[PDB]
């Protein structure tokens, strides 16, 4: 049978996993360039990571069904945060269903309320803190500080977001963060020994859940008392009923929130940032132009028809933002029996991964790819791939892109904004979530 080709390990015990840290594009392409071929092998701490990375092959890493490419043991780092026997750690039809109940809490129909709410929640945040005629700030903070708040604002009923502010859940949510160690992977030895990580993330995760379930108490009694519908992600959770007939847990519910803001708050933060530093350089004016006449006859409280049905321009931006820097670099998968992926055989205990990252940079599919153009399309069908495909693909995807409009659209509308640096930020490799290098995000806003 014919595997890829390999590419060659120089270092004994770690392999590759250091050359791929520095310089991820950089390695990657490199591999397939000298293997000739858009599926190779790296090998990770010992481990074989074959990367498809040929987007003519796309369709083979996001279609083949869970019992065959698995999700389970490459989302294994994250069961201290989601839960034990939560979301992936679940059997795949619970999973499912489970991912199901969020899914639906992001209907089109929660939409037409969320708009005006993310609004107000950017508004007052330029209030506070964009109160002058000019100043400097930093963009990729003051986005995910936004991003949370706008998050809460549409998720969390007033009861639970005066309990759980915006800062409270960022720490409690930092803390868990902190614990994670996506190298547990390759490694999995780390996820049977004792970390100091592990019971710092089962004691944010314990308050967290402690948190729920008060405000479950509280919402019990204000209906008693009074009348007191709230209605929200939380109470949309708990109404939930599987297929078994049985609700879903606390302990469930808890695990789904947490899942919610791990995929949705760097990745919403990061995108609006970069969509914004690209619009405020000097050689993208002609686009900042096609924005702000796509927004020049908007009210100045937006409403659903105009985010939602009115902002091609606005959504090109965003994605072009995530095709040229991608948040996830890699995608991955456990491969449960032998895959044919183009000319080769993927034998079963390979991870597989497709890599955003990789096929994004793909100079057929995205010819010029370090050039971000909101106009392009791509060139292969399917290569593009920042909110992934198939059996897994994103769920959030319009939740996010509805904030990161809505951001858009009410900052140019009232500010223009200048980078402090004659390029656009690098992107930053060494987090989890790949953004713009913080420190690079100095801006200057100019009130219209
Ligand atoms: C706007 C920026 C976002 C980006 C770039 C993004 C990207 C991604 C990607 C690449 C995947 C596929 C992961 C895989 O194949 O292993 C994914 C899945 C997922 N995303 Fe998003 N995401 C974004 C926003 C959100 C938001 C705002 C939420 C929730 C509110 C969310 C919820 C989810 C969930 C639950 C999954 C797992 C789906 C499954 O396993 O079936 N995402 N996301």
């Not at 839960?83 to 899914?103: H, I, K, S, T």
């Not at 720490?171 to 160690?181: H, T, W």
Request: charged fraction near 25%.
């Amino acid at each position: 049978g014919k595997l890829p080709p390999v590419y060659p390990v120089t270092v004994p015990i770690l392999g590759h996993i250091i050359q791929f840290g520095k310089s991820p594009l950089g390695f990657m392409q490199e591999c397939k360039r000298q293997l000739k071929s858009g599926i190779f092998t790296i090998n990770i701490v010992g481990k074989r990571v074959t990367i498809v990375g040929d987007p003519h092959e796309h369709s083979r890493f996001f279609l083949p069904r869970n019992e065959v490419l698995s999700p389970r043991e490459v989302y294994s780092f994250m069961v201290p945060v989601f839960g034990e026997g939560v979301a992936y750690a679940a059997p795949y039809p619970r999973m499912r269903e489970q991912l199901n109940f969020l899914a639906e809490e992001l209907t089109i129909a929660k939409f037409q309320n969320f708009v005006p709410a993310i609004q107000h929640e950017v508004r007052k945040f330029m209030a506070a803190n964009w109160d002058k005629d000019e100043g400097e700030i930093n963009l990729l903070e003051d986005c995910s500080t936004m991003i949370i708040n706008t998050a809460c604002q549409c998720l969390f009923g007033e009861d639970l977001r005066k309990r759980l502010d915006a800062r409270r859940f960022a720490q409690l949510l930092a803390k868990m963060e902190s614990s994670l160690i996506p190298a547990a992977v390759f490694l999995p030895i780390l996820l049977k020994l004792p970390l100091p990580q592990s019971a710092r993330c089962h004691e944010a995760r314990t308050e967290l859940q402690k948190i729920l379930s008060e405000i479950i108490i509280a919402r019990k009694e204000e209906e008693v008392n009074k009348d007191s519908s709230t209605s929200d992600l939380l109470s949309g959770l708990l109404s939930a009923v599987y297929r078994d007939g049985t609700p879903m847990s606390l302990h469930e519910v808890c695990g789904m929130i947490v899942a919610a803001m791990f995929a949705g708050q760097h990745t919403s933060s990061i995108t609006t940032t970069w969509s914004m530093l690209h619009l405020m350089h000097p050689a993208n004016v002609k686009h900042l132009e096609a924005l702000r006449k796509e927004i020049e006859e908007f009210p100045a409280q937006l409403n659903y028809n105009n985010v939602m049905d009115e902002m091609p321009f606005a959504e090109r931006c965003a994605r072009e933002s995530i095709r040229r820097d991608p948040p996830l670099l890699m995608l991955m998968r456990k491969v449960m029996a032998d895959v044919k992926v183009g000319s080769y055989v993927v034998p079963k205990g390979d991870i597989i991964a497709c890599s955003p990252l990789l096929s994004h940079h793909d100079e057929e599919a995205f010819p010029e790819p370090r050039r971000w153009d909101p106009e392009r399309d791509e060139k292969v069908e399917g290569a593009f791939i920042g909110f992934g495909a198939g059996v897994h693909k994103c769920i959030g995807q319009k939740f996010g892109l509805l904030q990161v409009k809505t951001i858009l659209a009410t900052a140019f509308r009232s500010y223009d904004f200048q980078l402090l640096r004659d390029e656009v930020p690098d992107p930053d490799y060494h987090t989890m979530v790949v953004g713009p290098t913080a420190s690079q995000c100095r801006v200057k806003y100019i009130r219209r």
